[PDB]
Amino acid sequence: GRGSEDFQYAIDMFKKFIEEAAASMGPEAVKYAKEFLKLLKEYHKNGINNRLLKIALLLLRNQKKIVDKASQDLWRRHPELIAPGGIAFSQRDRALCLRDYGWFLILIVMCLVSGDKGPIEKIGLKCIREMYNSLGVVPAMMESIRCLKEASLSLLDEEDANETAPYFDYIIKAMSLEHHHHHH
Ligand SMILES: C=CC1=C(C)C(Cc2[nH]c(Cc3[nH]c(CC4=NC(=O)C(C)=C4CC)c(C)c3CCC(=O)O)c(CCC(=O)O)c2C)=NC1=O
Structure with missing residues (x-):
């Protein structure tokens, strides 16, 4: 692992995410992510929003800490996920x-630096549909992004959490509709 307070760190985190998830999100999504990466670098040439990049880096360096804390909360609130017969x-x-x-966190960070829920509309919504095609309807999954939201926002102040919370709410709502309207 390695953390950094540079713009190149966030760029490298997006590059590694594109490489790792390319086969999972499909070709239309890696094209979106590649264009996003090119545009963020182009606008970085004209100066970047320091407050947004600060919240973006803070969540990026502590990605594994957030993942472990959220997964631990999820297994406690829904032990059936890791029990025999679970997903x-x-x-x-x-x-x-x-x-x-x-990966869900990277999508959150992609929205932070851009101030727009675009990357969750294009990549997130498609991947939630494909994730439910492979998994099915498991009711404990609704608490998943909540644990990720509670684990991410606990590392931010009230001002930074208010900036990040809408993107988690957007994913939870989208998962909700995918969850209860899948087989319809
Ligand atoms: C851009 C970020 C991207 C995101 C968020 C995604 C989600 C995603 N997961 C999966 C598969 C997927 N997920 C999980 C587990 C899981 N995910 C959770 O968020 C929680 C919580 C749990 C644990 C309870 C399993 C076990 C599998 C394999 C199932 C199978 O192959 O039969 C697919 C189908 C394609 C694939 O196999 O990779 C897609 C689209 N794919 C991106 O590229």
């Missing part, structure tokens, strides 16, 4: 939970 019982499946947890 995260298998060590590979549980590792995939933590992977998507860190």
